[PDB]
Design an enzyme around this catalytic site. Structure first.
Site, PDB file in Angstrom:
ATOM      1  N   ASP A   1       0.854  -1.185   0.000  1.00 23.97           N
ATOM      2  CA  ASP A   1       0.000   0.000   0.000  1.00 23.97           C
ATOM      3  C   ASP A   1       0.893   1.238   0.000  1.00 23.97           C
ATOM      4  O   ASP A   1       1.265   1.749   1.060  1.00 23.97           O
ATOM      5  CB  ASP A   1      -0.929  -0.046   1.212  1.00 23.97           C
ATOM      6  CG  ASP A   1      -1.951   1.070   1.219  1.00 23.97           C
ATOM      7  OD1 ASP A   1      -1.855   1.984   0.373  1.00 23.97           O
ATOM      8  OD2 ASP A   1      -2.849   1.022   2.081  1.00 23.97           O
ATOM      9  N   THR A   2       1.238   1.727  -1.192  1.00 21.09           N
ATOM     10  CA  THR A   2       2.131   2.877  -1.269  1.00 21.09           C
ATOM     11  C   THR A   2       1.487   4.153  -0.741  1.00 21.09           C
ATOM     12  O   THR A   2       2.203   5.127  -0.488  1.00 21.09           O
ATOM     13  CB  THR A   2       2.605   3.089  -2.710  1.00 21.09           C
ATOM     14  OG1 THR A   2       1.478   3.243  -3.585  1.00 21.09           O
ATOM     15  CG2 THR A   2       3.457   1.911  -3.174  1.00 21.09           C
ATOM     16  N   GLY A   3       0.170   4.169  -0.558  1.00 21.54           N
ATOM     17  CA  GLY A   3      -0.519   5.296   0.032  1.00 21.54           C
ATOM     18  C   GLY A   3      -0.592   5.280   1.542  1.00 21.54           C
ATOM     19  O   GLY A   3      -1.183   6.186   2.138  1.00 21.54           O
TER      20      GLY A   3
HETATM   21  C1  LIG Z   1      -8.494  -0.861   2.390  1.00 22.51           C
HETATM   22  C2  LIG Z   1      -7.196  -0.566   1.633  1.00 22.51           C
HETATM   23  C3  LIG Z   1      -6.681   0.854   1.897  1.00 22.51           C
HETATM   24  C4  LIG Z   1      -6.728   1.184   3.388  1.00 22.51           C
HETATM   25  C5  LIG Z   1      -7.551   1.838   1.122  1.00 22.51           C
HETATM   26  N1  LIG Z   1      -7.070   3.208   1.235  1.00 22.51           N
HETATM   27  C6  LIG Z   1      -5.897   3.570   0.458  1.00 22.51           C
HETATM   28  C7  LIG Z   1      -4.688   3.744   1.377  1.00 22.51           C
HETATM   29  O1  LIG Z   1      -3.527   3.890   0.604  1.00 22.51           O
HETATM   30  C8  LIG Z   1      -4.867   4.980   2.254  1.00 22.51           C
HETATM   31  C9  LIG Z   1      -4.744   6.270   1.439  1.00 22.51           C
HETATM   32  C10 LIG Z   1      -4.832   7.474   2.379  1.00 22.51           C
HETATM   33  C11 LIG Z   1      -3.605   8.348   2.635  1.00 22.51           C
HETATM   34  C12 LIG Z   1      -3.700   9.550   3.576  1.00 22.51           C
HETATM   35  C13 LIG Z   1      -5.023   9.876   4.263  1.00 22.51           C
HETATM   36  C14 LIG Z   1      -6.251   9.007   4.009  1.00 22.51           C
HETATM   37  C15 LIG Z   1      -6.154   7.807   3.067  1.00 22.51           C
HETATM   38  N2  LIG Z   1      -3.780   4.981   3.206  1.00 22.51           N
HETATM   39  C16 LIG Z   1      -3.980   4.810   4.627  1.00 22.51           C
HETATM   40  O2  LIG Z   1      -5.065   4.690   5.093  1.00 22.51           O
HETATM   41  O3  LIG Z   1      -2.820   4.792   5.401  1.00 22.51           O
HETATM   42  C17 LIG Z   1      -2.922   4.907   6.894  1.00 22.51           C
HETATM   43  C18 LIG Z   1      -2.049   4.124   7.372  1.00 22.51           C
HETATM   44  O4  LIG Z   1      -0.640   4.947   7.177  1.00 22.51           O
HETATM   45  C19 LIG Z   1      -0.910   6.195   7.368  1.00 22.51           C
HETATM   46  O5  LIG Z   1      -0.421   7.103   6.175  1.00 22.51           O
HETATM   47  C20 LIG Z   1      -1.493   7.453   5.501  1.00 22.51           C
HETATM   48  C21 LIG Z   1      -2.754   7.284   6.514  1.00 22.51           C
HETATM   49  C22 LIG Z   1      -2.442   6.302   7.377  1.00 22.51           C
HETATM   50  S1  LIG Z   1      -8.317   4.375   1.237  1.00 22.51           S
HETATM   51  O6  LIG Z   1      -7.793   5.739   1.334  1.00 22.51           O
HETATM   52  O7  LIG Z   1      -9.168   4.272   2.421  1.00 22.51           O
HETATM   53  C23 LIG Z   1      -9.202   4.101  -0.311  1.00 22.51           C
HETATM   54  C24 LIG Z   1     -10.355   3.110  -0.388  1.00 22.51           C
HETATM   55  C25 LIG Z   1     -11.062   2.894  -1.717  1.00 22.51           C
HETATM   56  C26 LIG Z   1     -10.610   3.653  -2.958  1.00 22.51           C
HETATM   57  N3  LIG Z   1     -11.277   3.458  -4.226  1.00 22.51           N
HETATM   58  C27 LIG Z   1      -9.452   4.632  -2.868  1.00 22.51           C
HETATM   59  C28 LIG Z   1      -8.739   4.855  -1.548  1.00 22.51           C
END
Ligand SMILES: CC[C@H](C)CN(C[C@@H](O)[C@H](Cc1ccccc1)NC(=O)O[C@H]1CO[C@H]2OCC[C@H]21)S(=O)(=O)c1ccc(N)cc1
EC number: 3.4.23.16
Lengths: 99, 99
Positions: free
Chosen positions: B25-27
């Site tokens: 999960d690069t996000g």
């Molecule tokens: C269920 C899989 C995963 C959790 C999904 N998420 C993408 C994810 O990359 C989010 C993307 C994200 C990044 C920043 C804020 C909100 C969401 N990252 C995230 O939640 O990371 C958390 C854990 O590490 C911390 O750094 C970032 C937040 C913390 S998401 O934002 O909720 C998402 C769900 C469905 C779609 N179509 C697009 C995005």
């Protein structure tokens, strides 16, 4: 190019004639962008992640340019804390994970 | 390996002697795993995703092998929708984005 992950993988995108910053997010099934007033029809959707769900508007066949790589597909628009390019468009620019 | 994104980039991980599936999960800045028993001290923290903030248990210096690559870093445990491997560990296994 090659993008390391020491910092957030933020890139410039072009959508609906606007330039924005967004994350290349392999964890996002579908692209989700900050509130913006796009034209044309849309369908309601709910997307879930850490913390629960948000409501978004689903637009289809939207043209996006990501680092000069063009793509076209679904873009979700809603009160997201961050713009993320999801897999539905990362595939279309040839993006891979490598280690 | 090279991983395309037509489907979720799910891989098998080994943590606390247990195998599991997890999303590259690069996000995600951080690595967040579903509820589990981990040996070690932990600290209560909060982490926020697309839908808000959740309570998690922070485990530091945890050994974790991702797709045959060893890492030692911080692991958050709590009610995440899915096991996600974030950048804090993706950097350790040498993972980059490429297009
Ligand atoms: C269920 C899989 C995963 C959790 C999904 N998420 C993408 C994810 O990359 C989010 C993307 C994200 C990044 C920043 C804020 C909100 C969401 N990252 C995230 O939640 O990371 C958390 C854990 O590490 C911390 O750094 C970032 C937040 C913390 S998401 O934002 O909720 C998402 C769900 C469905 C779609 N179509 C697009 C995005």
């Amino acid at each position: 190019p090659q993008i390391t992950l020491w910092k957030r993988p933020l890139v410039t995108i072009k959508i609906g004639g606007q330039l924005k910053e967004a994350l290349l997010d392999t964890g996002a099934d579908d692209t989700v962008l900050e509130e913006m007033n796009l034209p044309g029809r849309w369908k309601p959707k709910m997307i879930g992640g850490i913390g629960g769900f948000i409501k978004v508007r689903q637009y289809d066949q939207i043209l996006i340019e990501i680092c000069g790589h063009k793509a076209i597909g679904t873009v979700l628009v809603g009160p997201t804390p961050v713009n993320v390019i999801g897999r539905n468009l990362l595939t279309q620019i040839g993006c891979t994970l490598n280690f």
